[PDB]
Amino acid sequence: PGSMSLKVNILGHEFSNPFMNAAGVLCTTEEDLRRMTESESGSLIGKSCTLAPRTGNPEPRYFGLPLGSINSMGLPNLGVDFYLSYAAQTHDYSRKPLFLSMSGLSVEESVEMVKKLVPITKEKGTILELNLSAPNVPGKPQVGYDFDTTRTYLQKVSEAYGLPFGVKMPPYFDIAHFDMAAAVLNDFPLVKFITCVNSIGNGLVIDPANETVVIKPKQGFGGLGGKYVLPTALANVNAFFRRCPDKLVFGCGGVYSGEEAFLHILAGASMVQVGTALHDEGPIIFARLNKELQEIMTNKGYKTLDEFRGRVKTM
């Protein structure tokens, strides 16, 4: 205290800064995870994994846009065994804490996956982010848009895993939905953080030149990231910050600079995840974001994030 710091605390762990990759970006392979570990990021998270490996959807399945991105990756991943081995043997925990995202396509699959994480969480401190918002799996709706199904996942994972974990939520657009989602989450004491938000699901981008969609899967429909999602993300962060006071909120969506990171934290974010901008710029972005956030804080006379986290002013 009394000195400028970007440090963050979560259940004992101390993080150097609030920044990490958004799940799915620069975190699928050992090489990806090494580059994230080597970066100036406060933490990193592994690709949303499934019990068995997946190669994902056919190409093209990612398209960069002026205002962000559209993707239908289809959960390409090396399978849970790979991520667990990485967490257990490979990751350098002296550099930074590690999160793993898990996206079992059924409650049954999720239970089996999280049971395997338990020993490694105990041994190494690996943190779980349960993905309830994957929008690009043909035939599987975003779990988080069904509160009955969501309650089932949270119950079974709480029983099987039995340790503090977090959830990656879809964006909500209705006050009643904020209320219902919070009511479910507030029934699970083991849920200690909420990541707001996953991509804005099932957008469509068309090229006027050739009258053709720009991605191949699902007739061109894909999740939107980047500048498109910033107001949505801030609203979700703030809505859950207020409704779930005993839980932390991680902000994800539209972060390209210190300015957006500042707004996320104002809204209530503990950690700030970076997807599209990281895909564009590479891991050097974390060095830039640390600098830019420090600049804004200096200009406003803040030394720590604790001075302005959740202090957004209403009228």
Ligand X SMILES: Cc1cc2c(cc1C)N(C[C@H](O)[C@H](O)[C@H](O)COP(=O)(O)O)c1[nH]c(=O)[nH]c(=O)c1N2
Ligand Y SMILES: O=C1C[C@@H](C(=O)O)NC(=O)N1
Q: Which residues bind ligand X (CB under 6 A)?
A: 22-25, 47-48, 62, 69, 71, 73, 101, 131, 168, 198-199, 225-226, 229, 252-255, 274-277, 279
Q: Does 206 bind a second copy (CB under 8 A)?
A: yes
- Residue 37 site contact among ligand X, ligand Y, a second copy, none (CB < 5 to 8 Å, cut-off depends on kind): none
User: Distance between CA atoms of 99 and 32, rounded to whole angstroms?
Assistant: 14
> Do 52 and 23 form a contact (C-beta atoms < 8 A)?
no
Which residues, other chains included, contact 140 with Cβ-Cβ below 8 Å and sequence gap of 6+?
A: 105, 134
Instruction: Out of 43, 110, 232, 270, name the contact with a second copy by CB under 8 A.
Output: 232
x-or-dash string of contact with ligand Y, 66-95, rule CB under 6 A:
-----xxxxx--------------------
Size of interface with a second copy, in residues (CB under 8 A)? 56
Q: List the structure tokens of 44.
A: 């990193």
Identify the burial level of 150 via C-beta atoms within 10 angstroms of its C-beta, where 0-12 means exposed, 13-18 middle and 19 or more buried: buried
Q: Does 291 bind a second copy (CB under 8 A)?
A: no
Q: Considering only residues 110 through 139, tell me which ones interact with a second copy, judged by CB under 8 A.
A: 135
Instruction: Out of 192, 218, 247, 279, name the contact with a second copy by CB under 8 A.
Output: 218
- Residue 276 site contact among a second copy, ligand Y, ligand X, none (CB < 5 to 8 Å, cut-off depends on kind): ligand X
Instruction: Out of 68, 104, 223, 258, name the contact with ligand Y by CB under 6 A.
Output: 223
SS3 293: helix
Burial 70-88 (b: 16+ CB within 10 A, else e): bbbbbbbbbebebbbebbe
Instruction: For residue 218, count other CB atoms closer than 10 A to its CB.
Output: 18
Q: Does 67 bind a second copy (CB under 8 A)?
A: yes
